[PDB]
Design a protein around this ligand. Structure first.
Ligand code: BCL
Ligand code: BCL
Ligand code: BCL
Ligand code: BCL
Ligand code: BCL
Ligand code: BCL
Ligand code: BPH
Ligand code: BPH
Ligand code: U10
Ligand code: FE2
Lengths: 250, 304, 48, 42, 281, 42, 48, 42, 42, 48, 42, 42, 42, 42, 48, 42
């Protein structure tokens, strides 16, 4: 048709594009809030749109995103500097309130639903998935903490169907009160598991699941998030933990 | 035989779970393929089922017969022995009617032979398989975005042997057939049009292919990094922002200087895919009847 | 200690004995004194 | 929401008109007619 | 600057030795212990494109040229603009890339995500550095490299890019495009994937993780999971870098001749050695 | 009200004009007529 | 603790408190000098 | 719902008067018959 | 129901008068037979 | 643990011991050092 | 008040002038006709 | 301690004098016409 | 009941009314046999 | 059975009868001899 | 353990026991090693 | 048990001779001399 023609519909329309896209990327999180709960200093060169249609996956009603941004979940920090930019500091222990590394938020009590008529996640004792018949079978195995010390025995699996991949290692204590712990943070070398995230004297800090079967969405934030709690902090400052944090490969 | 429980990765197998039933069919889905548990403790291990009929036994069969059309022009030169066939499994070659016959299908089986048949069986091997990334995208009630990166993908296929070399009066302007043949054409459209560098359409067609290792070099790293929280389930993180959507919405803001959402990261991933072969769709749709040279196009618009 | 709503911070007088006492170090020595820096400029060398 | 106040006019709106300056300046300072900076000696 | 849920994540540390000495948030941008270093490297290298401008003859980004050192000066240096200024931008840019890939680790120890992100820019330091530290280092001097520009190395990738004949002939390269065409094969889908969940046709329920085994199994027949496409999307884009370094670790230092002279060790076989056949015959 | 200075005026706003001052000192010199220091030896 | 529905702010009367200082008069002398420092340029040099 | 206004006229339609203003201004300046403003040289 | 109505048939109705018009305005303004806005001399 | 008002930290009385000894005399250990250091720079070599 | 006196006041004046002077040395090294030992060459 | 002793000036100033000496080496060891160690044969 | 009805009559209605027309308009406009609008002087 | 019926019947009439027609409409106009819409003139 | 005043830290007089041996004598013998070198470099051989 | 009585000798027996003939027929088929399908003509 022409030598210089189609490009002047490319630097104009397709340049009206990173202005149409970056907003569809700056929805969740925005609008901007400061460090207490207050209309912020700005929003950006790509201002945020008012949310559109999001029909919910399991008839859960009406929620519009960008959605919850305000201060509903509990926050507590002891300020060391007042001007915006410098970090904050926990009041008590940083493993107590949940400020800094271990991150979560208050969600509504409903287990992730998929399809057939039951929750997304269940163990092997309930959802009789795959059993044990012939040969020697490694279900019921000892574990080691980040302090290089025995913690508990994992004796059951949490199975899956659509994605065929187990998710949790239910650590039952001697008390019988079960403690929960995610999947992409564990490494077993030989016969006994060795953890490097949480010591064997900090496992009750992660509270228990009130239902041994229900996997609600309020409770999938700390169980897989507290592992970060001892990834930032643990453990200052001298001695045997320095030979357990630095170096290494995997 | 039993099924092992290796030391924490982990896995438990899936039994007889097909999927959903609303608009698809399931009777043609005859048998769930035998599960190759290839120590499937990393990804998955599931085969079947799938959609069967004639919206399907046409792409395979036209793929086949297109696939069959170029391969016997590899056995044609061999000497009728299977030794030369794998020795030149690539050195053999095949093209359409001569640059002085072109549009004419009247080329015999001797010379400009087996290009009119493969492109005839290809033309029902990808225009009824784009009618299955667009139709099975409704087999339940979903969108069609899957065939909106496939309608700008068979668009670089809508110049190379369709729209250029048919209203240009030449089949030799359509691509040779096989493994080695078409590479004396990826270095033939290059000596000819004056080096396609100063051609910022093929050139900025490349500027949407060097960026799909700038969006996927980090996507398979970062969603493998937020996984220790629970953002691998990409259908409970968008509206119901998960705890892997607060281990990611700060990172790239702090780093390079802009974050996305869990609906947001799939909107730059396919705005660096629907424009790969589109700017090069326009970047082989303008390398023809405009200015034949791009060295004699790169001295008229580019410094002026 | 935690904070509340608009407009901490803010707010006073950590905005009046602080932010008022740090900001005007860029709206005078670069606003009015730059016109004294204009002195050796506003004729060297625009006029030929 | 949508657009706030005390952050744009300090570092962003300061390079919104300066950006709009050099997209006007870099055009009218090179035409074979005007100049008014080099054309003042010869 | 911070998001609405960025009230809590704000915690100091992360950096190596000394303290929170460098770790201050400037804007949305993270200026950590590798922060005023990348402010140091950035405000030092943009003028390293404007240095080779008063000499070469081109201030314009069109044809700015800081050429690689001459092919034959040795293990020391070069002239000025033709290798010297080239050798100045050598530890300014490569000084910045890892003032940033271990400053990402100043955001990975700070929280507790997977250490897999400061790992994918690392292949960007395994195809670029297959051009400075690898090939130029041995066969003589830094002369076996390219000018820095946006165009100069283009007509360097073209004209001086047929020196191994026809490069499609190269088998390390071929298969460092065969991971560069499937690069975008598993993204044009994966990208449409999680838009059609929330927004189907109009007003229809959102989808769940079991409508992925009735669509892609309803597609090509394979379904390695929902996190099995962030582990076959990193099998797409990182590997177009070190099988390309492969035909830049074997190409010019061992076989500086044609690599179309490579596909004639497939016919030299006692079976079909003294007996030609197809095409060749 | 709002905004920040005890963080933004110590090493964040003082070079905001170093964005605008030092980026236009470069242009005022390279000119082969203005110069003010460059061309005076020939 | 934070805020409520659209908009807040808002709000009456909080709209004309933080959106009428460097936006109403902040873009008024910017327009004044856009006629003041333009009328001395209306004549030089569109004319030779 | 589904779309916006306090974001499509305060910052969108207000840039729709600058996006469309200058584009053809230099399309009718590239075509040499108007010019229209260059009264200086002549 | 069907497709977006309070979203799809208003703000994207613009590109029906925007992108459609412009590309058909493209192969038209150039042809030395038309031009129409180049006629000046007589 | 944190205090109340203006300002911290800190730190009365450290308005004339911390923010004037390494802050205002910094405009002396480099600004006044420039007075004697520049007396042999402005002529090397703008006047060749 | 605020900021840092026992921290970021002896380190905001050690990599700040070195990030405004010694990086600025490179542009007056970008001369090779001036230059404080290149005068022998030109 | 005003600054850090066994942290900022036992090896970190060792890469301060080292960050200066060698970046200029490839300016003085370089140069098209100085050398006096390379050009001794030709 | 195996496929759709609603979605075809608004968004997929264009691929039979426009794209069919627009990429066919181009070929009949070209051939120097019709013109209508290229007639001008004929 | 295996399959449904009465909803594909508005697209198997929609775009089908032209998926058979478009390719056959493109071979009879290529020959300069017939054309019928090009030759019924002189 | 930290104190109060300036520098503290400091840490008076850890400001004159560690800012003396390697700060002064480190940079004074970085001035007794750098100045001297020049005296075989200034003229060999920038003059050519 | 051990040997497929039902599985192998009916459905896998078909593809055994099938493959034992397919690409071995593609050896001495239409050879330069033999043929015996191209011969009984000329
Ligand atoms: C516009 C310029 C040319 C062209 C430029 C190039 C260049 C450059 C390259 C190719 C390459 C390829 N091209 Mg091509 N190609 C064109 C456009 C096409 C189109 C199309 C129009 O839709 C198709 C179907 C193809 C087909 C192909 C593949 C066979 C091959 C690898 C692509 C890839 O990365 O997928 C990989 C993933 C897939 C799922 C594709 C499946 C194909 C298999 C997996 C790869 C084939 C490797 C080899 C030939 C097989 C040998 C097996 C032997 C028995 C040992 N090309 C046009 C005609 N194309 C690459 C190549 O290596 O060529 C041989 C290559 O570098
Ligand atoms: C001198 C060398 C020139 C040059 C010479 C050429 C030539 C010649 C060509 C290109 C083209 C292109 N160049 Mg170039 N190019 C240069 C520099 C580069 C560089 C670089 C060194 O940075 C790169 C990475 C590239 C690569 C590219 C691409 C951006 C572009 C083609 C896109 C494509 O292949 O997708 C194609 C993908 C598709 C069409 C999708 C497939 C759709 C089909 C219909 C579906 C069939 C799938 C099939 C069923 C699969 C079967 C699966 C089986 C079941 C296994 N060029 C230099 C400057 N380049 C090509 C182009 O088109 O220009 C824009 C082209 O012809
Ligand atoms: C008589 C012609 C005057 C002049 C006529 C104007 C007008 C009109 C304007 C400016 C404006 C500006 N001029 Mg002036 N200006 C001149 C030529 C120059 C030259 C030069 C290359 O010689 C420079 C570097 C400048 C510098 C500047 C900027 C500081 C300022 C644009 C700010 C903005 O963001 O918008 N002017 C000559 C000396 N200039 C803009 C401004 O900010 O207002 C003063 C503006 O409207
Ligand atoms: C005869 C012509 C040859 C050919 C000529 C060449 C030449 C010459 C080269 C290649 C190279 C490659 N070719 Mg080839 N190539 C051919 C045609 C093709 C085609 C095609 C479709 O036809 C394709 C897809 C390719 C693709 C490939 C890759 C396998 C390989 C480049 C790897 C890479 O980019 O990562 C590597 C990534 C990097 C080097 C980037 C490093 C990352 C850095 C750290 C980040 C930069 C940041 C930046 C400075 C800052 C900017 C950001 C802003 C601040 C915002 N070639 C034909 C066969 N090709 C290159 C190669 O193999 O060497 C490695 C190469 O030199
Ligand atoms: C030299 C003057 C040019 C011209 C160059 C411009 C430029 C530049 C613009 C307009 C703009 C306008 N022009 Mg005009 N315009 C001209 C003559 C026309 C003719 C005609 C030939 O009858 C038409 C249909 C238009 C179209 C239009 C309108 C859409 C718009 C202002 C009127 C309105 O608000 O509605 N122009 C003459 C030929 N026109 C404005 C616009 O389109 O933005 C909304 C704008 O920026
Ligand atoms: C021959 C002398 C050169 C010169 C080359 C340099 C170099 C090199 C530097 C200085 C630096 C400085 N110069 Mg001087 N400087 C000149 C041009 C000027 C002019 C002017 C209006 O022309 C002024 C007012 C100054 C004054 C100054 C100071 C602002 C600054 C010293 C530290 C500081 O920030 O306070 N220079 C002349 C043209 N200037 C230093 C600096 O940038 O601050 C850290 C520095 O490294
Ligand atoms: C196989 C690895 C693939 C890859 C991965 C990858 N790239 C990445 C990342 C990852 C994971 C990031 O996390 C980081 C990022 O921010 O995300 C986009 C990045 C990045 N990839 C970028 C660019 C890039 N990556 C490329 C390629 C690739 N990246 C590969 C395909 C390419 C091409 C096309 O080759 C480019 C141009 C940057 C946007 C960003 C790197 C951010 C960064 O590290 O900034 C540091 C730089 C400075 C502080 C500036 C100082 C440098 C000097 C001042 C000047 C430098 C001189 C030099 C010659 C520059 C010239 C540039 C061009 C003219 C060549
Ligand atoms: C945005 C540009 C990117 C892109 C996008 C893209 N590619 C796509 C798509 C999209 C949206 C699809 O929807 C489609 C897809 O379904 O992906 C899996 C596809 C696709 N892209 C593919 C490849 C591909 N991607 C490419 C690249 C790219 N595609 C870019 C990166 C290229 C290039 C570079 O040219 C190619 C060649 C395929 C994986 C797939 C195309 C699916 C298809 O059309 O196949 C139809 C099915 C057949 C032809 C079956 C026949 C099989 C053989 C032909 C017969 C021989 C085997 C047979 C089994 C004989 C044995 C006998 C038996 C009966 C026993
Ligand atoms: C929801 O689910 C799904 C998705 O998600 C949305 C998807 O996207 C997709 C679609 C995605 C894909 C199909 C991508 C899958 C890609 C792969 C599985 C990768 C496969 C890659 C290959 C087969 C390439 C292999 C290359 C080989 C073997 C080359 C041989 C190797 C060499 C010659 C060695 C090279 C070394 C050399 C040359 C050294 C040289 C030295 C000297 C010369 C000396 C599917 C199906 C899906 O189901
Ligand atoms: Fe993904």
């Amino acid at each position: 048709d022409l030598a210089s023609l189609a490009i002047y519909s490319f630097w104009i329309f397709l340049a009206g594009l990173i202005y149409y896209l970056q907003t569809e990327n700056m929805r969740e999180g925005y609008p901007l809030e400061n460090e207490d709960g207050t209309p912020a200093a700005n929003q950006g060169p790509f201002p945020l749109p008012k949310p559109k249609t999001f029909i919910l996956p399991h008839g859960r009603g009406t929620l519009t995103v960008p959605g919850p941004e305000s201060e509903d979940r509990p926050i507590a920090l002891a300020r060391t500097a007042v001007s915006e930019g410098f970090p904050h500091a926990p009041t008590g222990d940083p493993m107590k309130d949940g400020v800094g590394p271990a991150s979560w938020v208050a969600r509504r009590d409903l287990p992730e639903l998929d399809g057939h008529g039951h929750n997304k996640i269940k163990p092997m004792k309930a959802a009789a998935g795959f059993h044990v018949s012939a040969g020697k079978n490694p279900i019921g195995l000892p574990v080691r903490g980040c302090d290089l010390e025995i913690a508990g025995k994992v004796v059951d699996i949490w199975v899956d169907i659509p994605e065929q991949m187990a998710r949790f290692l239910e650590v039952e204590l001697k008390d019988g009160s079960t403690r929960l712990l995610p999947m992409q943070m564990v490494k077993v070398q030989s016969n006994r598991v060795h953890v490097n995230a949480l010591s064997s004297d900090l496992f009750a800090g992660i509270p228990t699941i009130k239902s041994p079967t229900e996997v609600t969405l309020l409770e999938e934030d700390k169980i897989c998030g507290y592992v970060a709690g001892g990834l930032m902090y643990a453990a200052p400052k001298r001695k045997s933990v320095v030979a357990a944090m630095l170096a290494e490969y995997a | 035989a039993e099924y092992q429980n290796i030391f924490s990765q982990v896995q438990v197998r899936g039994p007889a779970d097909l999927g959903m039933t609303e608009d698809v069919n399931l009777a043609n889905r005859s048998g769930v393929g035998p599960f190759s548990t290839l120590l499937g403790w990393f990804g998955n291990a599931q085969l079947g089922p799938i959609y069967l009929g004639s919206l399907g036994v046409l792409s395979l069969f036209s793929g086949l017969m297109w696939f069959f059309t170029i391969g016997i022009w590899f056995w044609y030169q061999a000497g009728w022995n299977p030794a030369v066939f794998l020795r030149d499994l690539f050195f053999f070659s095949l093209e359409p009617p001569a640059p002085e016959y072109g549009l004419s299908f009247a080329a015999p089986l001797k010379e400009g032979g087996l290009w009119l048949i493969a492109s005839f069986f290809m033309f029902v091997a990808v225009w009824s398989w784009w009618g299955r990334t667009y139709l099975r995208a409704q087999a339940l009630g979903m969108g069609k975005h899957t065939a909106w990166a496939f309608l700008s993908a068979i668009w670089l296929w809508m110049v190379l042997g369709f729209i250029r070399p048919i209203l240009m009066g030449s089949w030799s302007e359509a691509v040779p057939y096989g493994i080695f043949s078409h590479l004396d054409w990826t270095n033939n459209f290059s000596l000819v049009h004056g080096n396609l560098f100063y051609n910022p359409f093929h050139g900025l067609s490349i500027a949407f292919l060097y960026g799909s290792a700038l969006l996927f070099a980090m996507h398979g790293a970062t969603i493998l990094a937020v996984s220790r929280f629970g953002g691998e389930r990409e259908l409970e993180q968008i509206a119901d922002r998960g705890t892997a959507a607060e281990r990611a919405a700060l990172f790239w803001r702090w780093t390079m200087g802009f974050n996305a959402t869990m609906e947001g990261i799939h909107r730059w991933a396919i705005w660096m895919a629907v424009l790969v072969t589109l700017t090069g769709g326009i970047g082989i749709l303008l390398s023809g009847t405009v200015v034949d040279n791009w060295y004699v196009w790169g001295q008229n618009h580019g410094m002026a | 200690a935690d904070k509340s709503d608009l407009g901490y911070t803010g707010l006073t007088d950590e905005q009046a004995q602080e932010l008022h006492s740090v900001y005007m170090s860029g709206l005078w020595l670069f606003s009015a004194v730059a016109i004294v820096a204009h002195l050796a400029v506003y004729i060297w060398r625009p006029w030929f | 929401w949508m657009i706030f106040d005390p952050r744009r006019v300090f570092v962003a709106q300061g390079v919104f008109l300066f950006l709009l300056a050099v997209m006007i300046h870099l055009i009218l300072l090179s035409t074979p007619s005007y100049n008014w900076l080099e054309i003042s000696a010869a | 600057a911070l998001l609405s849920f960025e009230r809590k994540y704000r915690v100091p540390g992360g950096t190596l030795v000394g303290g929170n000495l460098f770790d201050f948030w400037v804007g949305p941008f993270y200026v950590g212990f590798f922060g005023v270093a990348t402010f140091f490297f950035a405000a030092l290298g943009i003028i390293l494109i404007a240095w080779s401008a008063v000499l070469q003859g081109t201030w314009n980004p069109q044809l700015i040229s800081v050429y690689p050192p001459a092919l034959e000066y040795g293990l020391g240096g070069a002239p000025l603009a033709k290798g010297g200024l080239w050798q100045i931008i050598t530890i300014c840019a490569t000084g910045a890339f890892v003032s940033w890939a271990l400053r990402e680790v100043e955001i990975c120890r700070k929280l507790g995500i997977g250490y897999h992100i400061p790992f994918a820019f690392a292949f960007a330091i395994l195809a670029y550095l297959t051009l400075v530290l690898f090939r130029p280092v041995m066969m003589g001097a830094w002369g076996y490299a390219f000018p820095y520009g946006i165009w100069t190395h283009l007509d360097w990738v073209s004209n001086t890019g047929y020196t191994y004949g026809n490069f499609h002939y190269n088998p390390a390269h071929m298969i460092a495009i065969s991971f560069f065409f499937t690069n975008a094969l598993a993204l044009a889908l994966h990208g449409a994937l999680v838009l059609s969940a929330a927004n189907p046709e109009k007003g229809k329920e959102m989808r769940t993780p079991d409508h992925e085994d009735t669509f892609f199994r309803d597609l090509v027949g394979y379904s390695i999971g929902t996190l099995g496409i962030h582990r076959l999307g990193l099998l797409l884009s990182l590997s177009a870098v070190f099988f390309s370094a492969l035909c830049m670790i074997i190409t010019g230092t061992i076989w500086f001749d044609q690599w179309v002279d490579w596909w004639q060790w497939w016919v030299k076989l006692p079976w079909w050695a003294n007996i030609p056949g197809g095409i060749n015959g």
